[PDB]
């Protein structure tokens, strides 16, 4: 863990979560809206470096 | 035998719990899934110590499932039976083949061939019991047993007990 | 590069996951923690009361058994049958009730230097003579003299409650 | 449903069966399945290395199994027996050794038993050894002159040789032995890291390309602040 | 009974690793393999014709003196000497009393070995130990 395509997977990953009755903090349209407002609570672990979707 | 063991577990959370309080659900899942479970590698995981200090590492979202996998490290008291160990328990069931002795969360089965020749099965007494000139073994009778063998499955443990050796049997 | 000793309590061959030397979550080497029935009973109940306290924030055998049963139901979830049997078994088979009695027992037996498994048996099984202990616990053979074991057993019965 | 943990294949360690393992793996209707009463994967029961075998025989002495290489025609008795190694040639499905005199050279056939004994005497140690399973349904005692036994062995060897988007994820989206293709991999106990696209495609797991070149974790630091 | 187990007839030539042990109860030679097979599970009758004494597994021990009779005398003497412990000083220099005391102890050991008065001798031995 180093001290401190992605869009497609994040949108699909959160779209599946929303379809499974996950809480919405703002299914593909909802995920896109969350990404626009930076409300997707996931971190991309680039292979490693962890990068928050918000930042 | 009772032990304190440092264990790890892979809990999975449905996306419905991806809220600001998902850590609380992980503690509930850890208690509701581990406590009372019989892991043959570690024995009967009985209780979880330091319930406010469980380590919850960053979760990983599965590709297609959509759930998040969490690696959880916790401290729990685990009961692991070993062959050649001496235990005490209360008989719960009696039958022609043998009787079962309850030791903690485990049951120990004593077959006819593992009992002294003096003891003889008798169904005349209600409930059925094993009678011998010196004493009678039946349900609720305290018995000291020696585990002669254990078959630890993935999620199940069974043992066979013996009372033929000296200083064993009824207390 | 990995491919294919049966466990035996008498030979102190407890397997792979219960070796004498253990590694905790902090990476520090530690001695295997084996608990006698009295010690195990205290550990389980002490954790339960602490867990109950956290939830709220956010004696004769019969009364203690009932008190344990009510506490167990309140502070445990589903599939708790195994723990219910354990607490009932522990309360009806322990030898030391109070923490002070357990503490003295640990201090007494820690000077023997035996394996953690053997000391747990000594505090869990009641014996009258060193011969009974030796046959019930084969691992004690050729490790402790009969005179040393005889005094330990007599002292252990001295601190036994009631 | 299975209680065992669900994992992903991270490595494929090719090797070779030992005779002990084949007997140990074998379960024998035993191949509803009578063995598991099931979902059943298939239970096992109980020619491509001829060039490799010939090379090994030439590279080592055929009496003591000590390393000599092919051109060498003497044990160089260092520990050794001093026998002159033969010239091995492949005829059909058999190996023939020829010794040159000190006047046609002496010729004989190296029996498979002799080759096996020498190989066992040769000094991967775990997964593939020079000395080294009926597929499941889904996939000399008396008389017997040498001529009869040889014919039967040849027939058996010949027979053996002859025998040998439906999800929201996809909706939104829209060098290893296995990668090259295997006998050589097993002989050398080749370890396949399954880091290539071909290996993951074969094993049906997400490849580390495009959307799979990273891992999507879940962060609790942001979750608490989102309410 | 020369170099093999009377029960399983295992010769030393075929199994050189074989060893023998004797239980102080009836001083009957038996190989360790038979001991593990029979007495490991629990106490059982000695496997000799005409012998029915119950002997435990733990009590088995190696034989030191080749003569079996001498082994019995020493072990009995060991038991007696544990109960009977005295020195010349204990009698305050009375050599005659010390010599008489030693003679009585030897008589007790001899009686135990031959079992002439085992019942009375054992009772007397128990009384002194308690006292
Ligand atoms: Zn099957
Ligand atoms: Zn050679
Ligand atoms: Zn024998
Ligand atoms: Zn005998």
DSSP-derived secondary structure for D94-106: EEEEEE----PPE
- Residue that has been written with the tokens 């071909």 in this structure: D198
Which residues are CB-contacts of C116 (< 8 A; sequence separation ≥ 6)?
A: C20, C31, C32, C33, C34
Task: Count the Cβ atoms, other than its own, within 10 Å of residue C109.
Answer: 19
- What is the count of structural domains for chain C? 2
Q: Which of C11, C54, C125 sits opposite B52 (nearest CB)?
A: C54
- The reply, when asked if residue D36 is annotated as ligand binding, is yes
In degrees and rounded to multiples of 5, residue C50 shows phi and psi of -60, -40
Question: In whole angstroms, what is the distance from residue D125 CA to residue D115 CA?
Answer: 19
- The size of the A-B interface in CB pairs under 8 A is 24
Phi-psi label, residue D189: left if phi above 0, alpha if psi -120 to 50, beta otherwise: left
CB B76 within 8 A of CB B34: yes
Q: To 10 degrees, what angle do helices C99-109 and C146-159 make?
A: 170
Question: In whole angstroms, what is the distance from residue D115 CA to residue D96 CA?
Answer: 11
CA distance D38 to chain B (A): 19
CA of E33 to the centre of ligand 3 (A): 6
User: Beta strand C21-23 with C29-31: parallel, antiparallel or unpaired?
Assistant: antiparallel
CA distance D181 to chain A (A): 27
DSSP secondary structure string, C44-108? Answer: HHHHHHHHHHHHHH---HHHHHHHHHHHHHHT--SS-HHHHHHHHHHHTT-S--SHHHHHHHHHH
- The reply, when asked if residue D33 is annotated as ligand binding, is yes
CB contact under 8 A, B18 and A50: no
Name residue C89's beta-bridge partners: none
Query: Which residues sit with Cβ closer than 5 angstroms to ligand 2, an ion?
Result: D 61, 63-64, 75, 80-81
C17 with C57, same domain?
no
D180-214 as b/e, with b when 16 or more CB fall inside 10 Å? eeeeebbbebbbbebebebbbebeeeebbeebeeb
CB contact under 8 A, B61 and D226: no
CB contact under 8 A, A17 and B19: no
CB B66 within 8 A of CB A17: yes
CB contact under 8 A, B55 and C36: no
CA nearest to C127, candidates C104, C153, C149, C108: C153
Are chains D and E touching, using the cut-off of 8 Å on CB pairs and a minimum of 3 such pairs?
Answer: no
Query: How far from the centroid of its chain's Cα atoms is residue C56's Cα?
Result: 29
CB A43 within 8 A of CB A10: no
User: D1 at the A interface (CB within 8 A)?
Assistant: no
CA-CA distances (angstroms) from residue D186 to D49, D51, D129?
11, 15, 10
CA nearest to C25, candidates B10, B8, B47: B8
End-to-end CA distance of chain B: 19
- Paired tokens of D168: 């929201």
Experimental method: cryo-EM
C7 with C72, same domain?
no
Q: To 10 degrees, what angle do helices C37-57 and C61-74 make?
A: 40
CA-CA distances (angstroms) from residue C99 to C117, C154, D58?
21, 20, 77
Question: In whole angstroms, what is the distance from residue B65 CA to residue D168 CA?
Answer: 11
C18 with C43, same domain?
no
**Which range marks the domain in which residue C10 is found?**
1-34
C46 with C23, same domain?
no
Question: In whole angstroms, what is the distance from residue D70 CA to residue D62 CA?
Answer: 12
Chain A: which residues have CB within 8 Å of chain B? 13, 16-18, 20-23, 41-43, 50
Q: Which of D169, D170, D223 sits opposite A41 (nearest CB)?
A: D223
CA of E48 to the centre of ligand 4 (A): 6
Chain B residues touching D210 at Cβ < 8 A:
none
Q: Which of C35, C51, C80 sits opposite B51 (nearest CB)?
A: C51
Chain C residues touching D126 at Cβ < 8 A:
1, 3
In degrees and rounded to multiples of 5, residue B129 shows phi and psi of -150, 160
C84 with C161, same domain?
yes
C62 with C7, same domain?
no
CA distance C1 to chain B (A): 23
Which residues are CB-contacts of C85 (< 8 A; sequence separation ≥ 6)?
A: B102, B104, B105
Peptide bond into B127 cis (omega under 30): yes
In angstroms, this model's resolution equals 3.4
Where does residue E48 rank: exposed (0-12), middle (13-18), buried (19+ CB within 10 A)? middle
CB contact under 8 A, C78 and B77: no
Question: In whole angstroms, what is the distance from residue E44 CA to residue D120 CA?
Answer: 48
Question: In whole angstroms, what is the distance from residue E101 CA to residue E91 CA?
Answer: 10
Sign of torsion over alpha carbons D65, D69, D71, D76: negative
Question: In whole angstroms, what is the distance from residue C125 CA to residue B87 CA?
Answer: 8
CB B134 within 8 A of CB B126: no
Question: In whole angstroms, what is the distance from residue B110 CA to residue B168 CA?
Answer: 12
User: E58 at the C interface (CB within 8 A)?
Assistant: yes
Q: Is residue B43 classed as helix, strand or coil in its secondary structure?
A: strand
C62 with C110, same domain?
yes
Chain C: which residues have CB within 8 Å of chain E? 134-135, 141
Opening angle at CA E36, ends E33 and E42, nearest 5: 150
C89 with C118, same domain?
yes
CA distance C93 to chain B (A): 8
CA of A49 to the centre of ligand 1 (A): 45
CB contact under 8 A, C125 and B86: yes
Question: Looking at beta carbons, which pairs linking D114-119 to residues 24 or more positions away fall under 8 Å?
Answer: D114/D62, D115/D53, D115/D57, D118/D57, D118/D60, D118/D62, D118/D63, D118/D65, D119/D56, D119/D65
DSSP secondary structure string, D33-76? Answer: -TTT--------B--TTHHHHHHHHHHB-TTT--B---S--S--
Q: To 10 degrees, what angle do helices E95-114 and E68-83 make?
A: 130
CA of D31 to the centre of ligand 1 (A): 6
Question: In whole angstroms, what is the distance from residue C38 CA to residue C44 CA?
Answer: 10
**How many helices (H) and strands (E) would you count in chain A?**
2, 2
Chain D residues touching C1 at Cβ < 8 A:
126-127
C23 with C1, same domain?
yes
Are chains B and C touching, using the cut-off of 8 Å on CB pairs and a minimum of 3 such pairs?
Answer: yes
CB D46 within 8 A of CB D61: no
């Amino acid at each position: 863990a180093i001290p401190k395509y992605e869009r497609a997977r994040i949108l699909g990953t959160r779209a599946l979560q929303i379809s499974m009755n996950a809480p919405v903090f703002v299914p593909l349209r909802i995920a896109m809206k969350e990404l626009a407002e930076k409300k997707i609570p996931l971190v991309i672990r680039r292979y490693f470096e962890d990068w928050s979707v918000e930042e | 035998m009772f032990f304190i063991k440092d264990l790890s577990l892979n809990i999975t959370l449905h996306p419905s719990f991806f809220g600001p309080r998902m850590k609380q659900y992980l503690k509930t899942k850890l208690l509701e899934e581990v406590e009372g479970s019989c892991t043959g590698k570690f024995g009967y995981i009985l209780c979880v110590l330091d319930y406010d200090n469980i380590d919850i590492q960053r979760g990983r979202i599965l590709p297609t499932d959509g759930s998040a996998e969490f690696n959880v490290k916790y401290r729990a008291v685990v009961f692991k039976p070993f062959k050649g160990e001496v235990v005490d328990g209360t008989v719960v069931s009696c039958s022609q083949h043998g009787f079962e002795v309850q030791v903690g969360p485990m049951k120990v089965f004593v077959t006819k061939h593992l009992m002294p020749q003096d003891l003889t099965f008798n169904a005349g007494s209600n409930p059925p019991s094993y009678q011998s000139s010196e004493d009678v073994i039946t349900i609720k009778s305290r018995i000291r047993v020696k585990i002669e063998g254990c078959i630890s499955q993935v999620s199940s443990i069974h043992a066979i007990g013996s009372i033929k050796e000296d200083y064993l049997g009824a207390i | 590069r990995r491919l294919k000793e049966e466990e035996n309590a008498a030979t102190l061959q407890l397997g792979q996951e219960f070796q004498l030397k253990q590694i905790n979550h902090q990476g520090e080497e530690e001695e295997l923690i084996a608990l006698n029935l009295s010690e195990a009973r205290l550990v389980i109940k002490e954790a339960l009361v602490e867990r109950r306290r956290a939830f709220k924030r956010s004696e004769t055998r019969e009364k203690e058994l009932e008190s344990i049963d009510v506490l167990l139901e309140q502070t445990t979830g589903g599939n708790n049958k195994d723990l219910k049997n354990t607490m009932q078994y522990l309360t009806n088979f322990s030898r030391f009730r109070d923490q002070e009695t357990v503490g003295a027992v640990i201090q007494l037996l820690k000077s023997t230097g035996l394996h953690p498994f053997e000391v747990a048996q000594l505090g869990s099984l009641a014996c009258d003579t060193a011969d009974e202990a030796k046959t019930l616990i084969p691992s004690l053979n050729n490790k402790i003299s009969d005179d040393e074991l005889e005094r330990i057993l007599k002292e252990l019965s001295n601190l036994e409650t009631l | 449903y299975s209680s065992a943990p669900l994992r992903t294949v991270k490595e494929v360690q090719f090797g070779l069966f030992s005779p002990e393992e084949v007997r140990a793996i074998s379960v024998a209707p035993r191949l509803k399945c009578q063995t598991c009463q099931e979902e059943c994967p298939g239970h096992f029961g109980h020619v491509g290395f001829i060039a490799k075998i010939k090379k090994v025989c030439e590279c080592v002495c055929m009496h003591c199994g000590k390393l000599l290489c092919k051109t060498k025609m003497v044990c160089e008795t260092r520990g050794g027996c001093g026998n002159t190694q033969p010239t091995i040639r492949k005829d059909g499905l058999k190996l023939v050794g020829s010794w040159k005199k000190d006047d046609e050279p002496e010729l004989r056939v190296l029996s498979t038993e002799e080759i096996l004994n020498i190989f066992k005497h040769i000094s991967n140690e775990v997964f593939s050894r020079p000395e080294w399973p009926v597929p499941p349904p889904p996939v000399e005692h008396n008389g017997a002159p040498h001529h009869a036994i040889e014919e039967a062995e040849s027939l058996l060897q010949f027979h053996v040789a002859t025998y040998m988007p439906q999800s929201e994820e996809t909706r939104a989206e829209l060098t290893g032995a296995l990668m090259r293709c295997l006998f050589e991999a097993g002989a050398s106990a080749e370890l396949d890291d399954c880091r290539g696209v071909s290996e993951n495609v074969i094993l049906g797991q997400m490849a580390p390309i495009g959307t799979g070149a990273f891992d999507v974790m879940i962060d609790e630091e942001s979750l608490v602040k989102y309410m | 009974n020369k170099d093999m187990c009377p029960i399983c007839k295992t010769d030393r030539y075929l199994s050189p690793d074989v060893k023998f042990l004797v239980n102080p109860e009836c001083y009957h030679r038996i190989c360790e393999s038979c001991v593990d097979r029979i007495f490991s599970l629990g106490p059982a009758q000695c496997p000799y014709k005409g012998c029915d004494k119950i002997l435990r597994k733990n009590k088995f021990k190696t034989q030191i003196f080749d003569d079996v009779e001498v082994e019995k005398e020493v072990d009995i003497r060991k038991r007696v000497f544990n109960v009977f412990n005295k020195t010349i000083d204990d009698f305050n220099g009375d050599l005659v009393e010390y010599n008489k005391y030693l003679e009585e102890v030897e008589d007790i050991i001899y009686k135990l070995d031959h079992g002439i008065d085992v019942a009375k001798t054992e009772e007397k031995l128990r009384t002194y130990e308690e006292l």
